[PDB]
Design a protein around this ligand. Structure first.
Ligand SMILES: *[C@@H]1O[C@H](CO)[C@@H](O[C@@H]2O[C@H](CO)[C@@H](O[C@@H]3O[C@H](CO[C@H]4O[C@H](CO)[C@@H](O)[C@H](O)[C@@H]4O[C@@H]4O[C@H](CO)[C@@H](O[C@@H]5O[C@H](CO)[C@H](O)[C@H](O)[C@H]5O)[C@H](O)[C@H]4NC(C)=O)[C@@H](O)[C@H](O[C@H]4O[C@H](CO)[C@@H](O)[C@H](O)[C@@H]4O[C@@H]4O[C@H](CO)[C@@H](O)[C@H](O)[C@H]4NC(C)=O)[C@@H]3O)[C@H](O)[C@H]2NC(C)=O)[C@H](O)[C@H]1NC(C)=O
Ligand SMILES: *[C@@H]1O[C@H](CO)[C@@H](O[C@@H]2O[C@H](CO)[C@@H](O[C@@H]3O[C@H](CO[C@H]4O[C@H](CO)[C@@H](O)[C@H](O)[C@@H]4O[C@@H]4O[C@H](CO)[C@@H](O[C@@H]5O[C@H](CO)[C@H](O)[C@H](O)[C@H]5O)[C@H](O)[C@H]4NC(C)=O)[C@@H](O)[C@H](O[C@H]4O[C@H](CO)[C@@H](O)[C@H](O)[C@@H]4O[C@@H]4O[C@H](CO)[C@@H](O)[C@H](O)[C@H]4NC(C)=O)[C@@H]3O)[C@H](O)[C@H]2NC(C)=O)[C@H](O)[C@H]1NC(C)=O
Ligand SMILES: *[C@@H]1O[C@H](CO)[C@@H](O[C@@H]2O[C@H](CO)[C@@H](O)[C@H](O)[C@H]2NC(C)=O)[C@H](O)[C@H]1NC(C)=O
Ligand SMILES: *[C@@H]1O[C@H](CO)[C@@H](O[C@@H]2O[C@H](CO)[C@@H](O)[C@H](O)[C@H]2NC(C)=O)[C@H](O)[C@H]1NC(C)=O
Ligand SMILES: C[C@@H]1O[C@@H](O)[C@@H](O)[C@H](O)[C@@H]1O
Ligand SMILES: C[C@@H]1O[C@@H](O)[C@@H](O)[C@H](O)[C@@H]1O
Lengths: 205, 205
């Protein structure tokens, strides 16, 4: 018996449109009694609105999931979520808790950065978005142009900087021509320390 | 009994000045007979120049190390290194092998990138070095100025790009003044696909 507790995605907690969930995975439950109940605890008080997914025999044992929709404000305010798993004839229930990382939240700085001169000898070129000074590391970055989402972009993991804040870069790739004929590209950042959790910074020739 | 086999550091294999080593860690050896011999195999042929570190009782069992100096060309040419561990009364020796990642090596592109205009409102500023298009991901990046190594720099892990090559950024932090009063900063890259495994690209106001 091993129990794994997963947090919601940042984007899910930052946009009120989306639905943030905490999922409780239990695996390696002996096929003897694969009957298991879930007790969910939000900051002490128990809650009872957790969908519990139908058990599924893994090829090797059973694995089952309990899903709990969370309130955007609760998670961001730092309430602990507690997953108590109960199994008939199991010495004691297992308890796993989760909460958003603790620490002074801190607003990210977003600078857009055009390609180098030496890079203009290719047919693709690199538009850079630097995002730094933020805390916690949970963040979301996307490129777009003319309100259309962009594609050839990859974003580094957050890296821990020397002041305890985090930074990342995001690299967008567009053909020299798209950038050459003017054209405005745009780096989007989602983070709990921004106003309305969101910022645009743009970049053109 | 568990055996862990570790590769040399990139910088060790790329500079002939340095000494690249492959280390064989074996842990969880029952304290009954903590006597264990090592057999080293380079691309089939056995070698016999591996220093073997004196066994050490872990607080919990024994852990012992065998260190093998490697030839820069051997590792880069892709020879497999094989660690055969022998223990008296152990059902069969354990075999672990290691070699440099396979795949067409590919030369990194290095572009230096000055700060954004909007970043000039601070007293620190960010000088960026983008390194992309390289394969394998083993690489080494450092900043300097006037042949003096620099400091406030952090470098992202390599990220897998859409063409199968890798890229990273490296961010150096200097006070606005150092950058303002001219001054030339310099990003260094070490990689097996560069000539003499090394490149400088510079950056000034
Ligand atoms: C029989 O066969 C079984 C399968 O059929 C097999 O079950 C596996 O057991 C493994 C061993 O226990 C277990 O391994 C763990 O996996 C953890 C990661 O799991 C995610 O990523 C995998 C890919 O890498 C996926 O395959 C998983 O399904 C899982 O995927 C995540 O799933 C969640 C839930 O659905 C999902 O969240 C929700 O997503 C939706 C969208 O769909 C929304 O976004 C919701 O908002 C969101 O809530 C995730 O998005 C999804 N992510 C991904 C990437 O897919 C892995 O992290 C575990 O590592 C832990 O343990 C080791 C050992 O200590 C630590 O080194 C490690 O750091 C982790 O634990 C640390 O513990 C520390 C304390 O000691 C603590 O301080 C640390 O904080 C903590 N770590 C961290 C990072 O904080 C572990 O590897 C595997 O998941 C099981 N597979 C399945 C399918 O269940 C079983 O074992 C077999 N049995 C036998 C006997 O053979
Ligand atoms: C009793 O107490 C014992 C300790 O006293 C304890 O021993 C520990 O056991 C652990 C469990 O087995 C074991 O955990 C492994 O650790 C691996 C990483 O170890 C490095 O990093 C640790 C910090 O994160 C350090 O503490 C380690 O010492 C080790 O540090 C590295 O050391 C080497 C050798 O010295 C060094 O190389 C040399 O350095 C010099 C400079 O000094 C030069 O540069 C040389 O050129 C160079 O050669 C490294 O630089 C140094 N690095 C660092 C960062 O410190 C960890 O990677 C292991 O993970 C593997 O297993 C899991 C499980 O499957 C996988 O998820 C994981 O990906 C790894 O295995 C994968 O296997 C796949 C196949 O299934 C394969 O496809 C993958 O390729 C492969 N993974 C990868 C990434 O490719 C694992 O966590 C720990 O090291 C032991 N500690 C010690 C001190 O030995 C023992 O367990 C206890 N016993 C009991 C019963 O309680
Ligand atoms: C799963 O549970 C069953 C039942 O608890 C285990 O089978 C028992 O194993 C013990 C240990 O020798 C025996 O004394 C019992 O007589 C067994 N009973 C039955 C009904 O099989 C089984 O080994 C467990 N398997 C795992 C992987 O945990
Ligand atoms: C380490 O090895 C010793 C000896 O092989 C183990 O002790 C033996 O355990 C078996 C299993 O019950 C007994 O039948 C033997 O009589 C024991 N002999 C001695 C000398 O103790 C010991 O359990 C092993 N420990 C670990 C963690 O592997
Ligand atoms: C090792 C595990 O075996 C089974 C699969 O359903 C899991 O995803 C995993 O591969
Ligand atoms: C769990 C292991 O216990 C002992 C130490 O020497 C190791 O480094 C590790 O902490």
């Amino acid at each position: 018996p091993s129990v794994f507790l997963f947090p919601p995605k940042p984007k899910d907690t930052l946009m009120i449109s989306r639905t943030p969930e905490v999922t409780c995975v239990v695996v390696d439950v002996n096929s003897t009694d694969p009957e298991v109940k879930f007790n969910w605890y939000v900051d002490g008080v128990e809650v009872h609105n957790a969908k519990t997914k139908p058990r599924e025999e893994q090829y090797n044992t059973y694995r089952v999931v309990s899903v709990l929709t969370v309130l955007h404000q609760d998670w961001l305010n730092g309430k602990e979520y507690k997953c108590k798993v109960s199994n008939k004839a199991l010495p004691a229930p297992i308890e796993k808790t989760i909460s958003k990382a603790k620490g002074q939240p801190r607003e990210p700085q977003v600078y857009t950065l055009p390609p180098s001169r030496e890079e203009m000898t290719k047919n693709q070129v690199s538009l850079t978005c630097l995002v730094k000074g933020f805390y916690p590391s949970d963040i979301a970055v996307e490129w777009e142009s003319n309100g259309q989402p962009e594609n050839n972009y990859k974003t580094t993991p957050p890296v821990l900087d020397s002041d305890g804040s985090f930074f990342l870069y995001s690299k967008l790739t567009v053909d020299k021509s798209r950038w050459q004929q003017g054209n405005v590209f745009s780096c989007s950042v989602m983070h709990e320390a921004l106003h309305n959790h969101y910022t645009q910074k743009s970049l053109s020739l």
